[PDB]
Task: structure prediction
Amino acid sequence: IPRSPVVTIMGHVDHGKTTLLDKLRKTQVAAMEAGGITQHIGAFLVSLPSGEKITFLDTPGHAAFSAMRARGTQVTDIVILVVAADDGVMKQTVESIQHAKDAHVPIVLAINKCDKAEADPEKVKKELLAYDVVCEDYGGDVQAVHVSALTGENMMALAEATIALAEMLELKADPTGAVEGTVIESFTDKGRGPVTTAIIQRGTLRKGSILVAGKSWAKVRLMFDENGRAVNEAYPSMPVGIIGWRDLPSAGDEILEVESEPRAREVVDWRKYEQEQEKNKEDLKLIEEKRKEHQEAHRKDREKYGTVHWKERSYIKYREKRQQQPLKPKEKLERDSNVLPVIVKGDVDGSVEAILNVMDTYDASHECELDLVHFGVGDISENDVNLAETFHGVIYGFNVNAGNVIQQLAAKKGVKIKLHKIIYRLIEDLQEELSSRLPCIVEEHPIGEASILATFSITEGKKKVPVAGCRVQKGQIEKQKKFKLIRNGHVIWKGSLISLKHHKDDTSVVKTGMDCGLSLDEEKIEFKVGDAIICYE
RNA sequence: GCGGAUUUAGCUCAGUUGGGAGAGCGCCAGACUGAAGAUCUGGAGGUCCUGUGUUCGAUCCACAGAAUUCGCACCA
Result:
């Protein structure tokens, strides 16, 4: 049976999600005055195109944003961000938004216990209290659309707005081949295989499942299946016969430390469900791009072609070869460049997606382009310390932490991890490597301060232009840099430097404590008296 | 700057107390070289520092007036 776009009521426990399901069971069936229920053991489930009162899944824990994945991104195509009508913001309510919108999963914020604030309101009538946890509008983002928790009402108005959000995403169902499904909640135990409650979104399960864990990936043998029925049964027999659009307790003892992020499927067909299996491990991720600065030299070949009698005989040949293809007589050997690209590691799915959204944007080399070359949801690894050492980068961790082996590897590489930064976001660091003083190249900045000694507009054994002698004591008063010389703060003149004319000494660069005469620009428009010459790139 | 101070072929030098500018490298072939070409030779290049105290010879040193290397003034 084709699944309606499901919600789950994500958010903090008893922020109206837990209290929703417990009363939902009893209330909904009366409160609709209509049917269209597709109830399953998982929660209380009723289809989206019922003209009154609709709700879907419960995750009896808290979070369910990454738990409820499917083959487009989430299975909860519309997600409910559960805030309480009584009490605003709680932690998992805001994680649900980030993970969903950044992963392009439409969002309902259904501040639950809807009856209790804004007087049993509809979709667009709870807004004040609903916006307490952020709401936006339709699309992959969050519209405030409401479902209650202590009555079956307001849920009619869930249907209305929620479907228009749901439009963008939906991964349907079948009662055929192997199953697809995700975990609604899956309990975490090491050294035990605890049961996994799942929304089986598509396909048929008998009693076999496959899950990911905080241990390892494994393919469990279920002891039994137990499920509420939509109903259509592939097998009417004593428990088997799961279809898509079903919630299923998958009871299996080969289950590991399966998180609420994994999926619970089954594969016994791979001519359809392999292509659903792949896809339903994702809804955590996005993209980054950046580019790096390099070296090249067209001299290491053309210089070599020249005279010397062997090389001349070669030269007659080289010219002929060049005519055929320019790349043919080349004998260049230019090499090596480094900037500082970094490696990104993160652990919260909405967080990495957020970092990625900012990061992909930066790929423009103003004068440098610097961000991450690699990102992943994981832990710091051997690769990350290697990356830091090679480019002259550093390891950017969100809150991931570094294991024992990577730390040893880090020491050998002569680098050390930065993680748990505060703010934990890596985009600030990545944008510091980017631009900082890199696009400054005509901008003023003291980086070549010196004091003006004199000028030799007048004779000094040679009468010249307004050649200003200056004692360099910071950076370089050189003809490369520009200047703004300040009498004490009042600019005398500002321009570039294009002279080194003197009569005592002439030097390419006036550095350190050396005095050399250079007119600042060519001549000077006010000369003699002054103090600091800020040379600026 | 000033100078000490060369003064003086393009520059450099000599011609010089005061009787031609000695010749040359940057022009130049021979020469040379393995050939090439400068050599050597001698010529192209002779502003005579500038112009002059000075001049039968001032072409010189020297000065009319000014420039400069840097000790020195400057150098702080």
Observations:
- The longest strand of chain A covers residues 179-186.
- Residues 32 and 52 of chain A are 5 Å apart (CA to CA).
- Residues 453-454, 459-463, 503-504 of chain A lie near RNA strand B (CB under 10 Å from a C1').
- Residues 179-281 of chain A form a domain with the Elongation Factor Tu (Ef-tu); domain 3 fold (CATH 2.40.30).
